[PDB]
Design a protein around this ligand. Sequence first.
Ligand SMILES: CCCCCCCCCCCCC/C=C/[C@@H](O)[C@H](CO)NC(=O)CCCCCCCCCCCCCCCCCCCCCCC
Ligand SMILES: *Cc1c(COP(=O)(O)O)cnc(C)c1O
Lengths: 69, 555, 149, 481, 14
Amino acid sequence: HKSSMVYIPTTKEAKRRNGGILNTIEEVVEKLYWTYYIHLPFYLMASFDSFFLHVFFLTIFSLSFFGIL
Amino acid sequence: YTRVPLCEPEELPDDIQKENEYGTLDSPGHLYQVKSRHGKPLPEPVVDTPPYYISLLTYLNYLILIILGHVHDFLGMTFQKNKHLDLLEHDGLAPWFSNFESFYVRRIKMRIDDCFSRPTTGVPGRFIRCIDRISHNINEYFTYSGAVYPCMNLSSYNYLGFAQSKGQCTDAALESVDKYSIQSGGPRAQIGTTDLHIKAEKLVARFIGKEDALVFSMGYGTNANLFNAFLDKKCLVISDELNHTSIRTGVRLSGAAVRTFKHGDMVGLEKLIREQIVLGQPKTNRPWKKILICAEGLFSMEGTLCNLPKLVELKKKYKCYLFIDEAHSIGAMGPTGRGVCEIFGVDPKDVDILMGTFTKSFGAAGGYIAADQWIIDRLRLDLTTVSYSESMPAPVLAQTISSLQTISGEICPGQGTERLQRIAFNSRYLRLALQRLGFIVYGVADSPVIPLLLYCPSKMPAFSRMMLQRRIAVVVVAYPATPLIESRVRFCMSASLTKEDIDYLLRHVSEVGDKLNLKSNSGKSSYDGKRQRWDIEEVIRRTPEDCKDDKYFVN
Amino acid sequence: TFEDENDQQMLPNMNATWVDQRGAWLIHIVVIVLLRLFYSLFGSTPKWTWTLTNMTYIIGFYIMFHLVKGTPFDFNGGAYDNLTMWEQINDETLYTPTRKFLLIVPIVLFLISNQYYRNDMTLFLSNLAVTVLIGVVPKLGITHRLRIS
Amino acid sequence: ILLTRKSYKPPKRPLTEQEIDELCDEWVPEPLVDPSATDEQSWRVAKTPVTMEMPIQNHITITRNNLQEKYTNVFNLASNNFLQLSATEPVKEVVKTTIKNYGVGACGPAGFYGNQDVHYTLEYDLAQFFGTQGSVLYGQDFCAAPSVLPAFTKRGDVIVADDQVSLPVQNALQLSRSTVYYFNHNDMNSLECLLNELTEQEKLEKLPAIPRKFIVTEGIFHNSGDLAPLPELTKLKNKYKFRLFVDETFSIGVLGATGRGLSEHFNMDRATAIDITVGSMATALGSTGGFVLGDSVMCLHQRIGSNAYCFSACLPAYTVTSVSKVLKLMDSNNDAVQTLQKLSKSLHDSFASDDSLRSYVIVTSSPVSAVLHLQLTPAYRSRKFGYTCEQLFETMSALQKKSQTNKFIEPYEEEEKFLQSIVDHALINYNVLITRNTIVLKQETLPIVPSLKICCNAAMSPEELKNACESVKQSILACCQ
Amino acid sequence: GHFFVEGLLGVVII
Ligand SMILES: CCCCCCCCCCCCC/C=C/[C@@H](O)[C@H](CO)NC(=O)CCCCCCCCCCCCCCCCCCCCCCC
Ligand SMILES: *Cc1c(COP(=O)(O)O)cnc(C)c1O
């Protein structure tokens, strides 16, 4: 049986097709990026509001890290 | 270039067409036959929950969104009232709608307006063809090129796969177009009746198991105009809290009093019945002239059934009346496809009024009312839509009659049971595979509605857009429609899907839900008591054989 | 009237049903704690941080639960057009567990904050005044449906 | 503290479970429906025609009372399809091609999916043809107005409605939950008086935010059948700052040089005269569905928050494709609106000039309507059945107010039987099928009286129509005596 | 005076 549906390869298969630990570093960075991004409402905001929330969080983290030391 | 183009059908020399609309069965081992319960009430549900930090994060997200939206509205309305000129007065005329009653739509909904109302073309079969959109200024307005791509359909109500253009029902509709017409005459009471209406009413009444029936041209209209006909302001209606909007509008139009009971709770129902019989009419305390109970065969946001045997018990004990809305149950549930009466073995004589629609599982339009003879005669004399609204056309009646005969086993035997078993196998397979992979899934084992919980407002657009990018079509719902802390994605399984498509879906869903941190299933959703995080290949290999055993389904 | 009551009973009010769900009692405490740590991260003296925490929480609660009348979306003809969100909780039934918990929170918050600005009479008086005048009075059983000018 | 107390009575004991059970068993309800008066009313079901194996066309073959009667080659004068364009071959070819390229059902509400490109094309065609900016489609015409009107009104708004509006508009007004006042049916003086008093009181009241104000009327009335004065309405709503809501189900395709409705008949602009227009694709366009015309903001808010739109499935594709084809056909070389106007003019002249019936019936329809209505000259009604309209309206309103279960009125029933006897005489003797105004009087809330109904379409020869008019006139004359 | 206020608040709580 055959139809007119074009399929989309899985990301694992795509990495298999395209072929050290630089990949591991990249994937841990992207894991952290997604984990931070999806749990805060950035998809539901505009650009200016998202930028201001970003700088707000960055300032909080920087101040907290400075105080901790 | 700004308006939706009129796409043209391709060539597809009829084999690719027949495979596009209805996938061919691969193995006889992918069918399942369901069994009755012989009048036994359901066990209490075992709905699962996520950890506490998911809920807290959801609350924080909604707080931030509301604060930002209100600040934006106040500043924009007060300062720059030149662009916001459709919310303010003009020479004494009030605006069409105020700014506060439309807060959610233009603040929280408008930013993800591309996940809703996607234009399509062609038959909404196994593969649906979508028209691609480009958004400007974050879904401010869309523009359309001429490109069209097919996606795997998991959104449309096509339970038995009767929506096609090559079967026998399509031929019946084509014959009816030639024979009668596409034009009605008027109301059924004036000139609108034909012999096809009489045949359809007789066949529906025989199929359900009741004595007589009526057919209409809309389901919403049926539910909206029934209670006005047989109710009044001195009666009481005790309806479930999850009922459809049409029932609410129909009850509101009559004038009766309304009291609701919590979904899936019968002790509360009996307590409410006793208290309302004792109390009587408000502010006058005279006896209630009538009491009616409204429910649904299957709630198509939770996937759960209604405890029909116990409802019959209380209605017989306290002398109430029963109304059941079998929109999602008829045709697609039961050993032979008769609804919840077949599932629970209840004789279809204890239910006073039964109604449903041909839209969901028959690939047509309209609705019906089935009851006893004297009730039907009085209603036919008293209903409003029988006197004031136009009757349903000929092609729709032909399609409905052909589909009802096909399911009943009267024409081309062997197809109805095959469809009824394909859908039953597919639903169980997907539910068990998802629950083993590590997600949270609602509903009974056989329901063709498979909710999957997200719990975070920002995971809705991400899931929808990634799935569309991977050529899968889904539907997502949010706070005004579902509880604030439970936003989900709804799958609708048809009998036109093959197990290969389900495996493709499973692989893509597993990867996306791993990436978005959605596998938060507990141990409460397993027959043992231990949490499950199986691998994709193991679950693919071992699920098709284990999905036929009832000991693996906790609910 | 009659129609009004039937409309108010015909549907669960989605504007005020989320309170009795899984995790609101806890989110109140969580946001209090978060505000405390934020003002600590500012860096000023403890009394200023605690009085700022108390004012911020009390004023936010008042502006959200007590200022606006109606529902942010269509519910019925009007139904709840002249009621704030606090008057809609548990379909107009006073002193339910949720209302008790929401009443207790400001008092205990003041008790915890008390032992840091006790030496200053100005801050103590201002904190007590704001608390008892904004967080306990509108939530009382005699201020229900009390419209003035 | 002691002196402040109020003087209460000691509280009583609560009931006991056995007491509760006995009380519950003592209560007895009523049946779902009322089977008392079913048999003396069930003649309506037995006298309903049923055509077989044919379209509902000019010449049909009907039956009555479960195949026990049969009539062949009956001349039809009870069909609402005025233009009869939907039966021509091009529309049939379009329908066949649409059914072969799509399904028959939409399978989904407009919110998620099932809103194909054909729906958008039909909406564009409607908006361009009728001159407004946008339009929306509805599943059926009966559910359009009761969904549109409550979406734009609430508790605190004002509606000024006509004196005799049909049932869907009454449902919309009852479900709208606003304040409603009635003027007197094309008596502009009463409308001006009511608007004047209302705006004066509003100026006196000095409200913070002004409410929404609507004038609700109809193009061609459903029961009466008379035209509406548009220029006066638009002038005084411009003067008093109101909005106009026109429900022209029976005039789109009937009025105007090109059948574009009331606005063309009065040579006006629809975009500035009427704010909301409710139509129907099931009377003059020969299809199924309904629509609403307006501006962009109104249409967007309808898509957002109209119940019958967002909680119902989309209507099939063949309907919308056929309607688009019919719109193009009317756009090019009509001749059919002209034929219909000529036939209606001749019919009204025939039934208005004759004096022999002037002591029994009065013609209520206007000369431009395509449906001719008849009454019974209240002197004759009082003489033969012994009541007038006001007695009936008062009785029925009193019955509704106190919620009396069995609402049966005998003089009304007898008058209905007499009119049906007239219809039966005409059908049996001359092979002419006219109809009766079928109403459910226990649902109405405005004054109404039973009547007849004679419809005309654009596919009938003048000769045949004149002969049928003479035959029905003879039938009324014979049965009246 | 602090102890009186705290005791009054406790009584109010109860
Ligand atoms: C009106 C124009 C005023 C102009 C001044 C600007 C003020 C704008 C910000 C405040 C606007 C609030 C208006 C009313 C909002 C609510 O009521 C709405 C409409 O009812 N509810 C709903 O939509 C239904 C409920 C929706 C979800 C509510 C729960 C979301 C999570 C809240 C959990 C409880 C939070 C803790 C209690 C409040 C603590 C406040 C924290 C203060 C610190 C942050 C804010 C500075
Ligand atoms: C879908 C739905 C309706 C409306 O049916 P349509 O034919 O699509 O208008 C009515 N009742 C229930 C329970 C529904 O789910």
